[PDB]
Amino acid sequence: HHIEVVSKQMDPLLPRFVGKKARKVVAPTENDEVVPVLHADPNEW
Amino acid sequence: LEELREYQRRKRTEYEGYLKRNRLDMGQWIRYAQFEIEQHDMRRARSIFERALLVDSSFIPLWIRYIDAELKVKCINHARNLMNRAISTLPRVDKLWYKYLIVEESLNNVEIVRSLYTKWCSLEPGVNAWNSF
Amino acid sequence: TSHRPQLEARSGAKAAAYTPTGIEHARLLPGHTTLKYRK
Amino acid sequence: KATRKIRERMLEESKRIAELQKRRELKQAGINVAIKKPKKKYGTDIDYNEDIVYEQAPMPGIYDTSTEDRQIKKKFEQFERKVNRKGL
Amino acid sequence: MTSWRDKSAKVQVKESELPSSIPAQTGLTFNIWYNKWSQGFAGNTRFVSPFALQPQLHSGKTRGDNDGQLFFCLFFAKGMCCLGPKCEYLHHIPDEEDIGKLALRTEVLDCFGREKFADYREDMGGIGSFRKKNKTLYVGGIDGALNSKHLKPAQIESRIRFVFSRLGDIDRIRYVESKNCGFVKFKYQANAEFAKEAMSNQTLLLPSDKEWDDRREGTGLLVKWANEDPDPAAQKRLQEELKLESLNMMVHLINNNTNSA
Amino acid sequence: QRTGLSQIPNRRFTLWWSPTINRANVYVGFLVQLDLTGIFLHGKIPTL
Amino acid sequence: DEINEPPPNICEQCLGDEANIRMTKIPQGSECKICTLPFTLYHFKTSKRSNNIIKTLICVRCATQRNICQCCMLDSRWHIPIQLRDHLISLVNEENVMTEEAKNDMMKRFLSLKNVKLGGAQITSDPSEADNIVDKLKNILLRAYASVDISHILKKLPLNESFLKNPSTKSFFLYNIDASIPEWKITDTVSQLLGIKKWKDGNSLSLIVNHKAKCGGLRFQSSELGERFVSKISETLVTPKGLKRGVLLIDRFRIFIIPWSSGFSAASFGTNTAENIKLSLSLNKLIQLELG
Amino acid sequence: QVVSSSTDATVRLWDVVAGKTMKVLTHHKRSVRATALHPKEFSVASACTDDIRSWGLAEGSLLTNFESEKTGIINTLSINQDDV
Amino acid sequence: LYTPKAEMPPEHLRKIINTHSDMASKMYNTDKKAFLGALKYLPHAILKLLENMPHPWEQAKEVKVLYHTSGAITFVNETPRVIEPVYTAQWSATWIAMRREKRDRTHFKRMRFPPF
Amino acid sequence: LLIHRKGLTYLHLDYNFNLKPTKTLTTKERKKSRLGNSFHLMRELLKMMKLIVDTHVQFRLGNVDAFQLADGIHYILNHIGQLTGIYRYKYKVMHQIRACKDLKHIIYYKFNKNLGKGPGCGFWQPAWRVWLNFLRGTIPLLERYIGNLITRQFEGRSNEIVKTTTKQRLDAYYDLELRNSVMDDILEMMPESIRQKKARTILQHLSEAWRCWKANIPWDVPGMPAPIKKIIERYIKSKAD
Ligand SMILES: O=P(O)(O)O[C@H]1[C@H](OP(=O)(O)O)[C@@H](OP(=O)(O)O)[C@H](OP(=O)(O)O)[C@@H](OP(=O)(O)O)[C@H]1OP(=O)(O)O
Ligand SMILES: [Zn+2]
Ligand SMILES: [Zn+2]
Ligand SMILES: [Zn+2]
């Protein structure tokens, strides 16, 4: 078709970012793979 | 069944309430993993072993018991392509190379150890490893 | 036995905002806005 | 502190056993009443029975299996079927 | 048609007859943010509706018909709408013509235009789910609806059958005496959604039923969603209708590949 | 009960000089009335 | 900066026929119906003068993992529900594949951030992979209670009457209706065979089917429609030492007709459900008697 | 833009505009206490206990291992203009 | 472009404020959040009201205002601008009118506070 | 609407902007209904305004005459300490209350030359300016404070609050830094033994070596390795310094 993207102008008295609220989010492990690690005395210590 | 179902519900709150405050204590990760193995649930048990490799991935008694979880139930390719991660993580560790050899010895295919020792001698280990070859 | 601090990022990935909630602190108000360059 | 929490544990252990003997006896009269939810304290509380807790899938290995998985669900469906009758 | 297409929709309730937005009296002081009564104990604050839907009398053409509105007036379903022919929503029962226009939108919305939710609810209340197409309406509160007089369970079944019959294609009805529960399945999702709003908090008793003067004191008949059917005959019948509707779209999913080539 | 100091001497002193301590003084916009009495309190004074 | 960079997911059916459509972007609009996190929301109207505004309900991350439209919640390739798309793929493959949903409010919050995928979407996203299964669909299309007594009920049933083709009443009796066949399909064919379309708004006919007693009861209005119904019933069975019955012909299922002339009132078929199961077994013997 | 060393025995190199790690140097066996950049050569040195290694910053590439055996815990590192 | 603001009837602002006396309908839920957003700007509206107060020689003052269309807040949109020799003559004329009245009246009664 | 959204319907707000309890409160309700200064400073400010506005309403109703209107406006502005409780919430406004009292002393003596005593001086222009200038500084502060309170109502209070090193938590924070710094230096001298079990034992010797320095007793552990002994001694001397 086509898409024209327009930002709407907000009421300055309304709570801006009506989705915004303090929340805790536990985040998963990132997608990139694992790097290789590449590396008598017990009676003393 | 609810004699067992609320049993399984109650135990999972007790171990994960503890691991919440102690991400460390690798002994509790293994014990809580072994509980889910005995429930005949390998989907949940593999999750706990993957979640525990995130906390430490150099504690190789965690690695070995996750191979033992896979071979006792005789799921073989999950323990095979695991080793594409395990020794590509820690190439210097002796026991991770030895265990993936001797398990292949009991599965009797010596075409596979013909390519394992190929890399493991290109890697220049040292005297105790060259002599077993 | 404290045994471990809190890693900062577990706060930083929280989805309040990139910013805090929208609290305006008195010490984060503008001041000393012109940097000084040496010759 | 330590003695109180052991005594308060065995009190809490009694409240289940008194409850679970009610349902074993209510099964005898036929009326099946389920176990309730232990109501959520804060807003974002978890039920660890209902889902996998923090489901981390293992890896995308080159050694595609797609054969053992069948046996795993066959064993698990065999297990809870034995729980459904023999009661462990 | 005879009821709907020729007429214009009438006004069920005048605006001066509309009920007060303030609820009755639950506690000591009225909270003006949440619009509730505070400081005390609530007293089982449900109540029956003073009004109801009259399908043949109240249907007619609306301004939503001339504009091309998809959705139905929820206050028409309740029997409360005060606009009449001015209202921007449809005042008639959903039918196979309009439901064909509720095809792309009905997956996530209901027939009134309200979004559906992922989880159902702990008590299977108001709106539906966008995971499961549930065409069966639970009926409860039948003791409260009949105003605590006695009837035989065969006669209760018929009194449920009649008032639900007008609201759309009724698949099946099976009143249970062991659990006083009505399981009313329709042909369409959109007629179950319409009937759930329309008969919620109503009275079953008829004007000749000797308690028509006193029926407002009740609680009405609860209308929630119905759970999965535990008897194994319908579960195999569920498996049957799953398979045959699958093959119907096995035909069309190789026709749009045939169009693709 | 062994170490803490008794309240009863402060209350004794304060009650004695209470028409001067709780005097009407200057108007501050309102006055607080003690419940179930008609005693007005002309400051926030806990010992009184 | 991960919020605003990925693009939206709208199918061509939601978006319409219009050339160029203006949309509204709100960077912290509603929260996702699936993941319950704030996300950027989009408004559009298909035409410039529509009554209805279309709104993205789920975020782009939850839509990518299911390969679905953000509004339809239908498939991006096949435009079918997820409750169906797994079941069709479960037929082509001998494995069973589903889309699991997280109940816990934080675990569903955890679930949306992983970038793998789940369910049938791993098939339906790839063009080459999805074509092989639609190909295999064609090959499948090539493959093509005794103790309770019910006596007082059974006397009211007019077990022994004919299509005498007289006016009689509006009221008829139906049986051999099996656990199948919703009441609308009966009342459609009766309206289709009598010829009247839109039977329900006219309120010409009334049906009671009990579905546990396996028998059904029919009422008409304006009795001249009633004999016209009998005038359209072609199939008969002249029972050998009995009275004839007209037969309704739904697909593969047979429903036999007697004029009532005194039957009505719910209790007619059975008071409780077990009393209907006993009447099911009573008629199952009598239908076997009727055919052989 | 930013080089960092921590007690998890790794040295990380950072892409700051993408906010992510360009390279992870994993060769040190214990906690890496000290770093110093060369003033001329565009390289970083890092020290672990008994282990001092130098690195080129263009690639995650080991330049030299040092004769730092038996030297103990290293607290600080300093590079001079004259390659000291 | 830029056309300036439409000057609206003063009855339009009255009707909106008389409507928002009793907000029990659900139609008022977004406007209630606008009353809490207006609370940050209330000491600014107080300053505009109090600097534009009538002086004792004028009976009534008409002021330009700016109001939110939900009637949450009204700002007085003017500045009290004076000619300084005229203004000093205005107050000093008021000064002498006030000194004659205190001499001339036998008993001056003072207003009661608060007035209501 | 703010008082009701909190749930505080036992708190009554009258039309002269007094906040009145209606009831005896529980301990739980008393903790819940404490309002900040930003609420109460906003309320006292509405109360001064409602006061002045209603003085103009009485004249426009015809209850008072023009001379009484000027005397009442001039009375409010010199008695804001007596009429509102604005100083309870931001006490620096006593500068403004004392400057209006100073201006009233110099104005009353010009106005009442060869006149008597009693009301009737409505020259309110100097004290009006004092309150207009006070507003100038109160706008930015209340804009920030009311903005913070209102943001907490719709979005919540963040869970990422980092508390600073103040004088009441200084000894606790010194503890955690010395405890982490001692475990670092000892775990880097150990070859490859263990990290979890020995660690609690090591910090018990540190706390014990500090009780010995304070008691002036020598700290000798007979089978302790010499490099673990020199790290604990170095860090005990640093704490003692
Ligand atoms: O305390 P006093 O020596 O009797 O002085 C009073 C007092 O003024 P200050 O206390 O502010 O100096 C009165 O003020 P309040 O007692 O009401 O605070 C004031 O009366 P108003 O301010 O109410 O007008 C009155 O002045 P007057 O009697 O002219 O009204 C004035 O007496 P002096 O004019 O002798 O100072
Ligand atoms: Zn309407
Ligand atoms: Zn989402
Ligand atoms: Zn779509």
User: Cβ–Cβ contacts within 10 Å for residue G76, how many?
Assistant: 20
3-state secondary structure chain I: CCCCCCCCCHHHHHHHHHHCCCCCCHHHHHHHHHHHHHHHCHHHHHHHHHHCCCCCCCCCCCCCEEECCCCCCEEECCCCCCCHHHHHHHHHHHHHHHHHHHHHCCCCCCCCCCCC
The set of chains that have 3 or more CB pairs under 8 A with A is: B, C, D, G, H, I, J
Quick check: A20 and J155 CB within 8 A?
A: yes
What's the start-to-end Cα distance of chain C, in Å? 52
Q: Pocket of ligand 1, candidates J75, J76, J108: which has the most ligand atoms within 8 Å of its Cβ, to mutate?
A: J108
User: Rounded CA gap, B14 and B8, in Å?
Assistant: 10
Residue of chain D whose Cα is closest to the Cα of B76: D68
Compute chain G's Rg from CA coordinates: 29
Resolution of the entry in angstroms: 2.5
Quick check: I23 and E22 CB within 8 A?
A: no
* Closest Cβ–Cβ partner in A1, A6, A25 for G19: A1
User: Rounded CA gap, J90 and J81, in Å?
Assistant: 12
User: Rounded CA gap, I16 and I31, in Å?
Assistant: 12
**Distance of alpha carbon E98 from the chain centroid:** 17
Exposed, middle or buried: residue B77 (CB in 10 Å: 0-12, 13-18, 19+)?
middle
List beta partners, residue J59. Answer: none
3-state secondary structure chain E: CCCCCCCECCCCCCCCCCCCCCCCCCCCEEECCCCEEECCCCCCCCCCCCCCCCHHHHCCECHHHHHCCCCECHHHHHCCCCCHHHCCCECCCCCHHHHCCCCCHHHCECCCCCECECCCCCCCCCCCECCCCCCEEEECCHHHHCCCCCCCHHHHHHHHHHHHHCCCCEEEECCECCCCEEEEEECCHHHHHHHHHHCCCCCCCCCCCCCCCCHHHCCCCCCCECCCCCCHHHHHHHHHHHHHHHHHHHHHCCHHHHHHC
Ligand 4 centroid, distance to E107 Cα (angstroms): 10
Ligand 2 centroid, distance to E81 Cα (angstroms): 5
> Which residue is listed with tokens 């003033």?
H39
What's the start-to-end Cα distance of chain B, in Å? 53
- Distances from the Cα of J170 to the Cαs of E173, J164, J183, J206, J213, in angstroms? 74, 10, 21, 19, 21
User: Rounded CA gap, G150 and G285, in Å?
Assistant: 15
Ligand 2 centroid, distance to C21 Cα (angstroms): 42
Quick check: J18 and F30 CB within 8 A?
A: yes
Which of the ligands is closest to the CA of residue G102? 3
Ligand 4 centroid, distance to E101 Cα (angstroms): 15
Residues of H in contact with A37 (CB under 8 A): 26
List beta partners, residue H51. Answer: H48
- List the single best residue of E114, E166, E171 to mutate versus G (max G Cβ within 10 A): E171
User: Rounded CA gap, D67 and G94, in Å?
Assistant: 12
> Smallest Cα–Cα separation from G208: which of E64, A20, E174?
E174
3-state secondary structure chain D: CHHHHHHHHHHHHHHHHHHHHHHHHHHHCCCCCCCCCCCCCCCCCCCCCCCCCCCCCCCCCCCCCCCHHHHHHHHHHHHHHHHHHHCC
To the nearest whole Å, the CA of G30 is away from the closest chain A CA by: 6
To the nearest whole Å, the CA of H23 is away from the closest chain A CA by: 9
Strand order in the sheet with G236-237: G205-209, G215-220, G172-175, G253-259, G245-250, G236-237
Cα three-residue angle C8-C13-C16, rounded to 5 degrees: 115
Question: Phi and psi dihedrals of J12, rounded to 5?
Answer: -105, 130
To the nearest whole Å, the CA of G75 is away from the closest chain A CA by: 20
Helix axes I84-104, J66-77, angle to 10 degrees: 110
> Smallest Cα–Cα separation from E220: which of E201, E238, E193, E233?
E201
Per DSSP, helices labelled H in chain H are none
Which of the ligands is closest to the CA of residue E118? 3
Quick check: E33 and J1 CB within 8 A?
A: yes
Q: Whose CA is nearest to atom 7 of ligand 1?
A: J105
Whether G249 contacts chain E with CB within 8 A: no
Q: What share of chain H is helix, strand, coil (3-state, %, to 5)?
A: 0, 45, 55
List beta partners, residue E109. Answer: E115
> Smallest Cα–Cα separation from E189: which of E137, E122, E246?
E137
Ligand 3 centroid, distance to E123 Cα (angstroms): 25
Touch between A and E (at least 3 CB pairs under 8 Å): no
Quick check: G109 and A3 CB within 8 A?
A: no
* Closest Cβ–Cβ partner in G103, G111, G116 for D47: G103
User: Cβ–Cβ contacts within 10 Å for residue J75, how many?
Assistant: 21
The set of chains that have 3 or more CB pairs under 8 A with B is: A, C, D
Does residue B79 contact residue B66 with C-beta atoms inside 8 Å?
A: no
- Distances from the Cα of I57 to the Cαs of I103, J57, J123, in angstroms? 20, 16, 12
- Distances from the Cα of E148 to the Cαs of E211, E215, E221, J50, J176, in angstroms? 10, 10, 12, 58, 71
Residues of D in contact with A31 (CB under 8 A): none
Sign of CA dihedral G220, G224, G226, G228: negative
Whether J204 contacts chain C with CB within 8 A: no
Which residues does a 6 A CB cutoff place in the pocket of ligand 1? J 101, 104, 108, 112, 117-119
Which of the ligands is closest to the CA of residue I108? 1
> Smallest Cα–Cα separation from B97: which of B110, B111, B83?
B83
Question: Phi and psi dihedrals of G21, rounded to 5?
Answer: -120, 130
User: Cβ–Cβ contacts within 10 Å for residue B20, how many?
Assistant: 8
> Which residue is listed with tokens 């059974």?
G154
Quick check: G83 and E119 CB within 8 A?
A: no
User: Cβ–Cβ contacts within 10 Å for residue B89, how many?
Assistant: 20
Question: H74-78: which pairs have CB atoms within 8 A and are 24 or more residues apart?
Answer: H74/H33, H74/H34, H74/H47, H74/H48, H74/H49, H75/H33, H75/H34, H76/H33, H76/H34, H77/H34, H77/H35, H77/H36, H77/H45, H77/H46, H77/H47, H77/H52, H78/H36
Does residue J42 contact residue J2 with C-beta atoms inside 8 Å?
A: no
Q: Collapse the DSSP code of H63 into the 3-class scheme (helix H, G, I; strand E, B; otherwise coil) and give the result.
A: strand
Ligand 4 centroid, distance to G98 Cα (angstroms): 21
DSSP state of G100: -
Does residue B26 contact residue B56 with C-beta atoms inside 8 Å?
A: yes
- Give the tokens for residue H19: 């906010």
Does residue E186 contact residue E195 with C-beta atoms inside 8 Å?
A: yes
> Smallest Cα–Cα separation from E174: which of E190, E156, E196, E191?
E156
Extract the runs of DSSP E, i.e. beta strands, from chain F. 32-33, 40-41
